[PDB]
Amino acid sequence: ESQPDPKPDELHKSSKFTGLMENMKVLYDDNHVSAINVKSIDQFLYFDLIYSIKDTKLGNYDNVRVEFKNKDLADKYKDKYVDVFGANYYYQCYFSKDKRKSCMYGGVTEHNGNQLDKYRSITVRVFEDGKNLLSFDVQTNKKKVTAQELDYLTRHYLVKNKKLYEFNNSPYETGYIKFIENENSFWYDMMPAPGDKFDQSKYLMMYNDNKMVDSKDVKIEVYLTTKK
């Protein structure tokens, strides 16, 4: 079966969030993690893997701590060359117990055996108040891609083109992204929980299942509702 669509009042209302939408915007803006063919260099917790990635900024490397929902996932990818992609956070990010040290969840896929000679296009149908007035595609060269990478790619587009997230707030009241693949479907709430503060780590933690979808069979739909 599939996951049931958002019940009424289930989705977070951006107007119920009184902090700065900026703290959410920063999760889907230009900044994020994208590393190709890297292998964990260290580990803090049993369920995380630490990587050293080349920084496009300047001749230098960054540190990214990747946390999974369990140790088995970490054990599976340690010692493996993987591609890492995801929304990272710095604020409460620790590597033991800095613009170059960040933390994230999941976003890991084995490199060898998962590459595609060419790029695949995944369509995104955006519904604003129930009407599909905008449709764009995202591309990937990974046979198995994490929902997180596709989620980021989609939201990043909506941020740069539809102002999904703005410094102060959002032009949309609620919003969720739904991934459809064969007999399964699931969605994430795109808006921050109610309150005056937004916990980026807690929010991004939803990606720690390292959930993946087949790039050739996945379909994406984003449902946004504007503010009256």
Curated annotation (Swiss-Prot):
Q: List the disulfide bonds.
A: C93-C103
Q: Which GO terms describe its molecular function?
A: metal ion binding; toxin activity
Keywords, in A-Z order: Disulfide bond, Enterotoxin, Metal-binding, Secreted, Signal, Superantigen, Toxin, Virulence
Recorded hits in Gene3D superfamilies, A to Z, give: 2.40.50.110, 3.10.20.120
> Where, per UniProt, does this protein localize?
Secreted
Q: What is its main location?
A: secreted
Q: Which PROSITE patterns match?
A: STAPH_STREP_TOXIN_1, STAPH_STREP_TOXIN_2
Superkingdom is Bacteria
Cellular component aspect of the GO annotation: extracellular region
Q: Which InterPro entries match?
A: Enterotoxin, Staph/Strept_toxin_CS, Staph_tox_OB, SuperAg_toxin_C, Superantigen_bac, Toxin_b-grasp_Staph/Strep, Toxin_bac
For whether the record's keyword set contains Lipid metabolism, the answer is no
Q: Name one Pfam family in it.
A: Stap_Strp_tox_C
Purpose? Staphylococcal enterotoxin that activates the host immune system by binding as unprocessed molecules to major histocompatibility (MHC) complex class II and T-cell receptor (TCR) molecules. In turn, this ternary complex activates a large number of T-lymphocytes initiating a systemic release of pro-inflammatory cytokines. Also causes the intoxication staphylococcal food poisoning syndrome.
Q: Which family does it belong to?
A: Belongs to the staphylococcal/streptococcal toxin family.
The note filed under miscellaneous reads: Lacks the zinc-binding site found in other members of this family, such as staphylococcal enterotoxin A, C2 and D, thus it possesses only one MHC class II binding site.
Assembly, in brief, is: Interacts with MHC class II molecules composed of alpha/HLA-DRA and beta/HLA-DRB1 chains. Interacts with T-cell receptor beta variable 19/TRBV19.
Question: What protein am I looking at?
Answer: Enterotoxin type B
* Protein's organism: Staphylococcus aureus
